[PDB]
Design a protein around this ligand. Sequence first.
Ligand SMILES: [Mg+2]
Lengths: 180, 50, 87, 59, 141
Amino acid sequence: PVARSWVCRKTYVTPRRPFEKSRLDQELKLIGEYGLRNKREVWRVKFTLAKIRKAARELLTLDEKDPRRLFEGNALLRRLVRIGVLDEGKMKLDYILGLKIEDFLERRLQTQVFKLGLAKSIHHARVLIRQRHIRVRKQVVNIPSFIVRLDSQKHIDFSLRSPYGGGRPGRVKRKNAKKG
Amino acid sequence: GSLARAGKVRGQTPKVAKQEKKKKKTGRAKRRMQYNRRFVNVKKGPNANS
Amino acid sequence: ARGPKKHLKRVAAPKHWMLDKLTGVFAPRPSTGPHKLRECLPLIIFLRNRLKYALTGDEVKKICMQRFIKIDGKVRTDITYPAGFMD
Amino acid sequence: KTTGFGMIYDSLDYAKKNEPKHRLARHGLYEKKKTSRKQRKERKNRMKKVRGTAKANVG
Amino acid sequence: GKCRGLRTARKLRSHRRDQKWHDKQYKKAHLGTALKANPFGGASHAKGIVLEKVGVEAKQPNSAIRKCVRVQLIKNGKKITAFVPNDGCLNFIEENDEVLVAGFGRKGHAVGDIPGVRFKVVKVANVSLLALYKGKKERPR
RNA sequence: ACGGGGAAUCAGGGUUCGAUUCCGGAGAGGGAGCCUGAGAAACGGCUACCACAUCCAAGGAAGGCAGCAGGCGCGCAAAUUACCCACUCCCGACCCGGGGAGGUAGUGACGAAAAAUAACAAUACAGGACUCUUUCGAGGCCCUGUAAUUGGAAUGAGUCCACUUUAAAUCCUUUAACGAGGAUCCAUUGGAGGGCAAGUCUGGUGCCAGCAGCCGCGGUAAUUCCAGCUCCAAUAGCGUAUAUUAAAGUUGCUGCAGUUAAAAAGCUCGUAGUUGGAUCU
Ligand SMILES: [Mg+2]
């Protein structure tokens, strides 16, 4: 007997066919376009979308005025609107099945800091975030997979203690300044 | 049979050393190279000879 | 078992006590008293967990042994005393 | 930003009464005994073999 | 055809019970004779002592000599033949050595040219054959 | 074969697992019998017998780790003879004492989550698209790479003041100082005939050695062995053996078959079982 918790999950599922040529080209295109590290980072978002589509398909088989359909349908739709994947004027349970992986991949902090002009590429954004140069609402974040909530889009800035903001220069400029 | 020819060709093969070469990229930069190679800048194969 | 039990595990405690999983292995077993074990609120879970007058179970004892708490007009110094409905 | 907890007592006497004895030693107001669980336990088991006042004269 | 009544559950269940025993996988798993005849006794690996070096000639149309070893199992005293996998890996084994032995890929069936051999060597004297073959470790002295 | 709560797999139905921290049961080497007590047929209580085993001056005396560490043995198969009652609780005559319950560190690629191994600019091309010049060409508009071409900018991983944490510590978090150019602060594991993504490249061997889950390769020009180079799959992980689920509509209730591929009893009677025609406001 211990005061410990053993609850955990796996966040991805592997594909059934390991060497499907059409799927290998489709997934590398996403990796290259959004600057991902490995195929496991595509199967994670794809798993999350697969679980969202499965809840919607189960709610869509209930009565249109089923009390559980109107409670957990509104919650799912509101959750999808909040992060910016679904539109404000499309809060219908049939528009969830029209969602794509690219919608979910566009809300990553890595994509957003690049699309806001902080970084010169999608690979510069990765290192900028991992090197503690970016903050969201006074909090320093160094997780590139941080999903940006809609009313956080305006509060992504350079960190207050970084050479790219008002901070001191890094070790290299300091060392070369004393070189002469 | 007669257990006297074990290791024959492995011991017969001449020994050739590996050429030293520039190290390989790893992680997010290795998979960027493949994307650039296959999609942005391009009936045969990657290892087609002649 | 060869006799009565004296312990209570935290997951086996009444759910309306609202006890978290990772504070400990054990929960206060209510003393025998006017109210049942599964239909009572012990004094420790009321002084510490609800009112937050105490931070640990040792502080509940220090409040109780000063004779500050009266349950229906009588001072109880037992920290697992089974208070209950309408008390 | 750092978050912590704080307590302010009416008097040093009330602080000494109610404070944990490990949080008083940090202020220099309590000295622990410099022994070990093993030391005390082994000493305890040796006195079981001795009966009477001769328990005191046991090391 | 098959009975289709509402009070047929006993008939259906008893017929399925009886007819499952004609499935050879089911019978092999659930009868118990294939567990007593298994030298490993249900284990994936086993340790043993080398008695002799043997050479097994391959089945036609192949013509070669697969290099195996005769091994006596420590836990029950049974005797098996184990194939030494790679090129020249028989030169690492010596008689009276203790070896780790595993199945050979087909759950008690022979594999390939090699006739009647169900096992393969994994380790010799607590050193894996892969490390010896690739020159990572040497035999203890 | 301890039983449930439950776990894996899964279109729907289903199949398999559950010694294991929660609930109930049972036991303390094997049987049996008791004393005390509210409660025990108690074993960190006693009395015998059976099996082991300890000290001895040989008269005698003392035993029970399926408690926490630890050792032997058995094996394919599993961690420290560590610190503490500070937390959660329990016991007592008790606000004070005790607790290998419990907590904290150590070992720990069982398994699960996040996430480094580089980024940018200027050059000149194999160059590429894109605009104009029919064409030569201009390209400062946008792109990829041998870049053994230049260039400073940024950062941990480490070393290490201090604070913080804590019963006392360690770790994480926070912070001074030092800390990155290219054989380095160097990513691995399996493969390249098909299934199944990726070389009839070059050298060696010559039905030998060996590969190969299956088909198959190897007999002097081997797409398959042994190596070099190159290539591709996942990636701080990836091979192998074994049990098991799906695939298996190859156990078929949903949902299979029985003329010739496996298969309808030689034929009829007959009890249990299964099934049973209209018809009532
Ligand atoms: Mg192919």
